[PDB]
Each structure stands twice: as C-alpha cells, then as structure tokens.
C-alpha cells in the first residue's frame, strides 16, 4: 500500500497528530545516535 485514502475525520486526526510537535523523542535520539561503521 502506497496511497492512504481516509474519511474526513481520520484525515483530521492524522493531520493534527502530524502538525503536532514531534513525539517519541527518546527513540529518535537513540536512532540518531546509532553511528554505523560501514566499509
């Protein structure tokens, strides 16, 4: 699946939760810390 078509109310809930400030900041720090050693 590549095109999520949503009813009006799911769309506003998705929109608000997307214009909301970022969440799960804790993991993002963890991910942003994973410095890989590629060769």
């Amino acid at each position: 699946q590549r095109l999520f078509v949503l009813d009006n109310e799911r769309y506003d809930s998705f929109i608000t939760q997307l214009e909301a400030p970022v969440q799960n900041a804790e993991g993002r720090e963890r991910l942003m810390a994973v410095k890989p050693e590629w060769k």
Partner: protein
C-alpha cells in the same frame, strides 16, 4: 565478527541467494520483487554486503506515498516497505544500522522535495517494538502503521 559495506542500491551482480533472514516473505521479495519494482521505478532497494564480497547480508526499501481525504491536500510521505537482516548476523545489530541509513536517506531526500513523514507497517510486535524503540509513533492511518515525522535539515 562480521564486517559490512555501506548500504547501496541493488544491482544485478549482487549475491542474493545466500541471504536468509527468517521470514521467507522478505527473502523472497529480495529475490523476486526487488529488481522488478526498480526498473518499473516504484521502490528502491538498498542492500549491504559482507566486506570484500557481494554476498547480501541485509536490505531495506523506499517508495514515496501520499495521504488524502475522500473528496497540504495530499500529504507527501515515504514508505519504508521492507527492513530485514540475514540470520547469520544477530547481535551485531545491523537492523539499527539500516534504519539509520534509511532515515538519514529520507532526510536528505526531504532537502530536495517536500516530505512530511516516513511510514511503516509493523508485521509482528517485534517489528513495532524495534520501530517504536527508534522514534516511530502509532498513527491513525492503520493500527500497524507507525509514522516518523520529518523535520527540515539545518
């Protein structure tokens, strides 16, 4: 130890047979529906190999997407469609290495074109737990669909 090379787009000389991740679905996609989607130009598959070899040991995929209502307006996103790692690399933790590369990739992407989040569908909860340990958040699109919002670079 296992030493791996930097994630790079799938070619046709890449060694795809010895790859064994544990889910036959995700090893089959690499064998079958990887090269095909790329010549079609839908998703792009990035693979890592064993050092000085071409034997694939892990991979991920990337396609764009959108979110709209039923009659800004389409919300521009990027789907992380597949993330898997061979069973002969375990505690080496090459999954987090691939998700780093992918996210960084999409962030550079977003400095070329407008991209508002990355999406992913968690197979099992272990996918979800991996993806929630690294920033993803439960969305409203689907109960297994998690999103990682994208902020502009610099």
């Amino acid at each position: 130890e296992i030493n791996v090379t930097a994630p790079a787009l799938l070619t046709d000389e890449h060694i795809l047979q010895p790859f064994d991740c544990g889910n036959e679905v995700l090893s089959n996609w690499l064998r079958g529906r990887a090269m095909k989607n790329q010549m079609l130009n839908a998703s792009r598959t990035f693979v890592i190999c064993l050092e000085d070899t071409l034997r694939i040991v892990g991979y991920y995929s990337l396609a764009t997407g959108s979110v709209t209502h039923a009659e800004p307006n389409p919300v521009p996103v990027v789907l992380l469609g597949r993330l898997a790692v061979d069973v002969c690399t375990r505690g080496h933790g090459f999954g987090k290495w691939l998700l780093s590369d992918a996210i960084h990739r999409v962030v550079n992407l977003a400095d070329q074109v407008g991209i508002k989040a990355v999406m992913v569908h968690a197979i099992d909860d272990d996918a979800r737990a991996f993806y929630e340990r690294f920033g993803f958040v439960q969305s409203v699109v689907a109960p297994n669909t998690l999103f990682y919002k994208v902020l502009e670079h610099h």
